[PDB]
Amino acid sequence: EVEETLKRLQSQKGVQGIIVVNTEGIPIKSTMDNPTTTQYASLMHSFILKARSTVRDIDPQNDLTFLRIRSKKNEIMVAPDKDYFLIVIQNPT
Amino acid sequence: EVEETLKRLQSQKGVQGIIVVNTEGIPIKSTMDNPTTTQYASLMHSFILKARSTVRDIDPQNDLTFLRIRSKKNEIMVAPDKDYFLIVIQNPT
Amino acid sequence: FRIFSRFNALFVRPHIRGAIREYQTQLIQRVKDDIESLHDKFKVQYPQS
Amino acid sequence: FRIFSRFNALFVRPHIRGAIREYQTQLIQRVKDDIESLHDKFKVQYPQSQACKMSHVRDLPPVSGSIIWAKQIDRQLTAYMKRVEDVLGKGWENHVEGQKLKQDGDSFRMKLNTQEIFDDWARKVQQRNLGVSGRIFTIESTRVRGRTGNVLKLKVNFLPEIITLSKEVRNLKWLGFRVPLAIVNKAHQANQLYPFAISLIESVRTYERTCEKVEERNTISLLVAGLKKEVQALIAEGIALVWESYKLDPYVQRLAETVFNFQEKVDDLLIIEEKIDLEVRSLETCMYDHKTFSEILNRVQKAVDDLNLHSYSNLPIWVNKLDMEIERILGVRLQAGLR
Amino acid sequence: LTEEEKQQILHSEEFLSFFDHSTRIVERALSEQINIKLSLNRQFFDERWSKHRVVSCLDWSSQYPELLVASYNNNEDAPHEPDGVALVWNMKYKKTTPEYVFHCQSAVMSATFAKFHPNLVVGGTYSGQIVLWDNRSNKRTPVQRTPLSAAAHTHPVYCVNVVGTQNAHNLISISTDGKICSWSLDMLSHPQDSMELVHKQSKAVAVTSMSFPVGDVNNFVVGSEEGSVYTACRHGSKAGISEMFEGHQGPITGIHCHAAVGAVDFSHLFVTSSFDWTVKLWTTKNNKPLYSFEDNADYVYDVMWSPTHPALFACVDGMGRLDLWNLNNDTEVPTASISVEGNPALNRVRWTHSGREIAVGDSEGQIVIYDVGEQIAVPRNDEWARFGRTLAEI
Amino acid sequence: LTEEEKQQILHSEEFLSFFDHSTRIVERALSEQINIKLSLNRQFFDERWSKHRVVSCLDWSSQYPELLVASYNNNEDAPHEPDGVALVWNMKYKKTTPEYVFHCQSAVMSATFAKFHPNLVVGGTYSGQIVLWDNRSNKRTPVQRTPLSAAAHTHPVYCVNVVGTQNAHNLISISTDGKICSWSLDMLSHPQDSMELVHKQSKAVAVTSMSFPVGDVNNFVVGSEEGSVYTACRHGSKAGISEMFEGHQGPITGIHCHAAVGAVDFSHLFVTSSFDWTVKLWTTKNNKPLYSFEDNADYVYDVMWSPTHPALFACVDGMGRLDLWNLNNDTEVPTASISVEGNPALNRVRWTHSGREIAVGDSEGQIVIYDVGEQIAVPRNDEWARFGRTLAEI
Incomplete structure (x- = not known):
């Protein structure tokens, strides 16, 4: 259930429901301000794709589902399956 | 100190290989061979520069202090602050 | 006011009544000239208070 | 026995006493077994028990430690005897088990005597004739491995172990064992004099370490020569003194402060020294430009001025040699630039 | 292709923050988040800093109630290697490794945290030289060291502590000779106060350990290896020994005042663990011991109140067993007990701040921490009332 | 591409892999760890617009809790200088000047923030016109102005407040003559509803203060200049005064309903501040003043319930002392009490909507922002029960 997923995700700290970004850089789900999240997801998609290339350079059998971009303000959990790329803003605390 | 640093960072999990990198990519140190260390660390350095740009996009004052990617075949580590770029080869588990 | 208001129904006792305000009549004088200081405000303020 | 300690109110009335004498034999045998366990623990000798090494960690000198351990074991045994006496009632010894138990306990206590070790230790102390009287410190000859020459290493005429003896007495006195008056006097004098000796020995060791560190870097000894001279003068003044005197405290205090100041100035001079040397080496390979050369020289001159304001010793000749080296390197660099 | 710039930058040591954050973060990276009554909780035994090494002291940081300090004497295994070994150990995430290390040229006897500053660690050594250490900075050497002088401590120091608040602090230390000395955290080179307890x-009094009534400064209490417990005021109208207690037959090893605070005032209760299995409880107003603990013989070292349960x-x-002893439920049988595996000479015990778990030192160095039952950890007003009446028992 | 095919692909049932992905990543990402009293808070005192010109009213913006409206009224130094001035002062950053300044032709006698418009300040003046101030505009002059007709207020209006939901508002205002009137915030050309309080x-009622109980908008309490507080119904068959209270023998100078919620209701309670130093903890349901805090020679000027502490x-x-009365803690002495320097007759108090900080008015214009102790400000969960018991006392 999509709603079950949303309620499960929003329970996480600093997370506003579930926002999913496809391979076009446009979030299929809307939870935050559209322009900021769209540009942010586009840069997300670009650098996760270059990371995919980077890993396939030496690991032609690995898949990407976990990445911890943590700063001193917030961490972004980015998880691509094949087209749906979950982006989750969470407090480091 | 140098040797104690690598020894302790390694035997904590029986890590396959780590070398100390205090410069921007292109490390001459090796742990299992020169190529798979040097070229891979240079690729990591190139990638994390882009990741730093990505984190600075949403706000330039943001900087990346910690980075991990845990994939189906490998777990890659780097904790940049100004020039200290970590490398960790380890099992996904 | 409050400090002896703690007694209130206490000094109805035959000995408490003698224990109260016979020793403190002078402090009753003192609160009197506290009242004197009170009217001091009234003394000269009328149009410039 | 906890169970009975719960109940003692008609033990005067000999109606409950039938029950206690019914289980009396089981009580006695079980107490005997416990005492056997205790004696077995005792048979593990004090040095072979972790209690000894632990009491050593606990500042208990080993002889005093063993003595006190045995005395505590005796105290526990007496506790068992009296606590049985109280619970079972008067005259448990009259029973054959009671008298056998009391004989066992008395024999164990006889094996558990303590004064003999006290006597032996006192005799050993008297025979060895510990003392501290003599020179303030002793200079001796040692051929340290690594060098052909005979090193006249400087030591302190003070055995660090003497204080241990004091502690033994400082314990055994309150243990109730009386020690000979000569031993009391020696231990008391050693105890009161210990702080001066330990300050002296730490000071001289620190001085030796810092001076060997200095001479490890010959480039700096010339500057520190004045402090070394004054320290040597202070040592010269001190050494003539006999071990006990009244100027001991002031002399030791001023020696300690002088050594500490010496060492701190040594380390400061050292660090500024490698700073200057590193900057000189950088100047060696610094690229040909008046500005960078001027900046290096400015920083070097600033460091030299910093040394000057500290009012060290022997600056001019040091500055002179440094300038000679600077000009030689400058001549080499100018040669390269000219060619 | 660089060949020396990397080599020299590795040789140059600007790795302070580097190593700090790397260590604080890699143990965090040890977490396995891969997408594909008494009870032991955490047994800690450092192989590198605790091989055949005796626990000397223990302390929990009130400022950071996950940080522990432990000591060690000189190592008989190897004299050439560093002798005074000090370990700072953590409870953030599981790891065999100690969080911090520290060395002192002299054997370390006791250690603790500073209340004035939440990062400094202060420890007394076997040479009677108080040692200061800065946690945040990455160094092995002592940061500061009190002078070894007649005025200062010269005999081995075995108890050190910080009294007062964070702007009225004062570091009080005892040497086994009988010297009390008061220092400040801002300067550790001259005794602000010092006098020889008599x-x-x-x-003098051969002081082994000391404690103080909770919530109070001054009016200290000390235990003597002579087997006598004393109360001595720090300044008052007259410093020195104020009261001598009938006391226990053997040396008094572990002394502690009561600490739990509630609806009643029990800050006058003292527990002393002597060398005769004898954990004696008394009160400062009565010269005689109030109760005796006896189940075996031979050296129970230290006793410590639980800050939450009264x-x-x-x-x-030393036989190798820790028993949690309650007073409200029992007076002759331990309400809880356990033995460290291997039956080792357990030296020191420390209640953690807020209680709910305990820390234990060992002769082998394998310090073990573990919780207590919830049904036994938490007190209640009933506990205070029944404790008052059990004191009224005799 | 566009936002329609995404809906169908979401409706597609290939999401089991995606659902398992999300479940795994969330459950693995669940674990989290770390990487490693009364006080003068502030001053606000203009000089160009605050030469004398005593304070009259204060308020905090609900939408922007960092903003405070002042209202400086009397002009006596220079007739040529502006007559009535309203200042808005920010809290996020410290400046010597108000963030914005507004000048009204007449003397402004009360002011407040608008709820619906977060960029608008509305005040009542002495002439009787309700006056706007749009902070978008660069004109210090009022943006929109009510007429001085018989329909609108023609007497010094001293009470203004906009209430209702964001989609159902009514700027209520009641003047000294006592005529209540509601306006639409966007249309002040005409009084959309009015009625003369009798x-x-x-x-007639010489009204001089009002307060709407929290939540309710239909019934409220009003404090007359004749010492007798009343309760009125804003809208309904009984529209107008519905209660006669004995009150106090002095003019009412302040009134306020309760300002807390979460536990057993207290909204029937409200405090009045009379003219003989007689603040009256007291409820609507009863008719007798519940209690009569008195002291002093001077007399109070305003009283406000804490927004957080029930x-x-x-x-x-008038002697410049501000005292916080914590009834649960005590009912006879001010729990906190300090006097601002220079003993000027303070004239207004307005707690911050956060409740963590208090403002005060002044007889010379220096608004003082006081902070309060943490223990004295935040109530506990038990606090409400204690308050209930204390009220049940008498």
Whole structure:
């Protein structure tokens, strides 16, 4: 259930429901301000794709589902399956 | 100190290989061979520069202090602050 | 006011009544000239208070 | 026995006493077994028990430690005897088990005597004739491995172990064992004099370490020569003194402060020294430009001025040699630039 | 292709923050988040800094109630290697490795945290030289060291502590000779106060350990290896020994005042663990011991109250067993007990701040921490009332 | 591409892999760890617009809790200088000047923030016109101005407040003559509703304070200049005064309903501040003043319930002392009480909507922002029960 997923995700700290970004850089789900999240997801998609290339350079059998971009303000959990790329803003605390 | 640093960072999990990198990519140190260390660390350095740009996009004052990617075949580590770029080869588990 | 208001129904006792305000009549004088200081405000303020 | 300690109110009335004498034999045998366990623990000798090494960690000198351990074991045994006496009632010894138990306990206590070790230790102390009287410190000859020459290493005429003896007495006195008056006097004098000796020995060791560190870097000894001279003068003044005197405290205090100041100035001079040397080496390979050369020289001159304001010793000749080296390197660099 | 710039930058040591954050973060990276009554909780035994090494002291940081400090004497295994070994150990995430290390040229006897500053660690050594260490900076050497002088401590120091608040602090230390000394955290090179504790006819007290009534400064309490417990005021109208207690037959090893605070005032209760299995409880207003602990013989080292429960404490036996002893439920049988595996000479016990778990030192160095039952950890007003009446028992 | 095919692909049932992905990543990402009293808070005192010109009213913006409206009224130094001036002062950053300045032709006698418009300040003046101030505009002049007709207020209006939901608002205002009137915030050209407050037939009410109980918008309490507080119904068949209270023998100078919620209701309670230093903890349901805090020679000027503590409330004075009365803690002495320097007759108090900080008015214009102790400000969960018991006391 999509709603079950949303309620499960929003329970996480600093997370506003579930926002999913496809391979076009446009979030299929809307939870935050559209322009900021769209540009942010586009840069997300670009650098996760270059990371995919980077890993396939030496690991032609690995898949990407976990990445911890943590700063001193917030961490972004980015998880691509094949087209749906979950982006989750969470407090480091 | 140098040797104690690598020894302790390694035997904590029986890590396959780590070398100390205090410069921007292109490390001459090796742990299992020169190529798979040097070229891979240079690729990591190139990638994390882009990741730093990505984190600075949403706000330039943001900087990346910690980075991990845990994939189906490998777990890659780097904790940049100004020039200290970590490398960790380890099992996904 | 409050400090002896703690007694209130206490000094109805035959000995408490003698224990109260016979020793403190002078402090009753003192609160009197506290009242004197009170009217001091009234003394000269009328149009410039 | 906890169970009975719960109940003692008609033990005067000999109606409950039938029950206690019914289980009396089981009580006695079980107490005997416990005492056997205790004696077995005792048979593990004090040095072979972790209690000894632990009491050593606990500042208990080993002889005093063993003595006190045995005395505590005796105290526990007496506790068992009296606590049985109280619970079972008067005259448990009259029973054959009671008298056998009391004989066992008395024999164990006889094996558990303590004064003999006290006597032996006192005799050993008297025979060895510990003392501290003599020179303030002793200079001796040692051929340290690594060098052909005979090193006249400087030591302190003070055995660090003497204080241990004091502690033994400082314990055994309150243990109730009386020690000979000569031993009391020696231990008391050693105890009161210990702080001066330990300050002296730490000071001289620190001085030796810092001076060997200095001479490890010959480039700096010339500057520190004045402090070394004054320290040597202070040592010269001190050494003539006999071990006990009244100027001991002031002399030791001023020696300690002088050594500490010496060492701190040594380390400061050292660090500024490698700073200057590193900057000189950088100047060696610094690229040909008046500005960078001027900046290096400015920083070097600033460091030299910093040394000057500290009012060290022997600056001019040091500055002179440094300038000679600077000009030689400058001549080499100018040669390269000219060619 | 660089060949020396990397080599020289590795040689140059600007790795302070580097190593700090790397260590604080890699143990965090040890977490396995891969997408594909008494009970032991955490047994810690450092192989590198605790091989055949005896626990000397223990302390929990009130400022950071996950940080522990432990000591060690000189190592008989190897004299050439560093002798005074000090370990700072953590409870953030599981790891075999100690969080911090520290060395002192002299054997370390006791250690603790500073209340004035939440990062400094202060420890007394076997040479009677108080040692200061800065946690945040990455160094092995002592940052500061008190001078070894006649005025200062010269005999081995075994108890050190910080009294007062964070703007009225004062570091009080005892040397086993009988010297009390008061220092400040801002300077550790000159005794702000110092005097030689004396009981009578000018004879000193061989102080082994000391404690203080909770919530109060001054009016200290000390235990003597002579087997006598004393109360001595720090300044008052007269410093020195104020009261001599009938006391226990053997040396008094572990002394502690009561600490739990509630609806009643029990800050006058003292537990002393002597060398005769004898954990004696008394009160400062009565010269005689109020009760005796006896289940075996031979050296229970230390006893320590639980800061949350008012009638509950711990005492660890050299025989190798820790029993959690309660007063409200029992007076003759331990309400809880356990033995460290291998039956080792357990030296020191420390209640953690806020209680709910305990820390234990060992002769082998394998310090073990573990919780207590919830049904036994938490007190209640009933506990205070029944404790008062159990004191009223005798 | 566009936002329609995404809906169908979401409706597609290939999401089991995606659902398992999300479940795994969330459950693995669940674990989290770390990487490693009364005080003068501030001053606000203009000089160009605050030469004398005593304070009249204060308020905090609900939408922007960092903003405070002032209202400086009397002009006597220079007739040529502006007559009435309203200042808005920010809290996020410290400046010597108000963030914005507004000048009204007349003397502004009360002011407040608009709820619906977060960029608008509305105040009542002495002439009787309700006056706007749009902070978008660069004109210090009022943006929109009510007429001085018989329909609108023609007497010094001293009470203004906009209430209702964001989609159902009514700027209420009641003037000294007592005529209540509601306006639409966007349309002040005409009074959308008005009615002259009257007591028992042919008895006007010299109104001088009002307060709407929290939540309710239909019934409220009003404090007359004749010492007798009333309760009125804003809208309904009984629209107008519905209660006669004995009150106090002095003019009412302040009134306020309760300002807390979460536990057993207290909204029937409200405090009045009379003219003889007699603040009256007191409820609507009863008719007798519940209690009569008195002291002093001077007399109060304003009183406000704490927005967070269901007992605490401030209390101005003419000798310059501000005292917080915490009823649960005590009912006879001010729990906190300090006097601002220079003993000027303070004239207004307005707690911050956060409740963590208090403002005060002044007889010379220096608004003082006081902070309060943490223990004295935040109530506990038990606090409400204690308040209930204390009220049940008498």
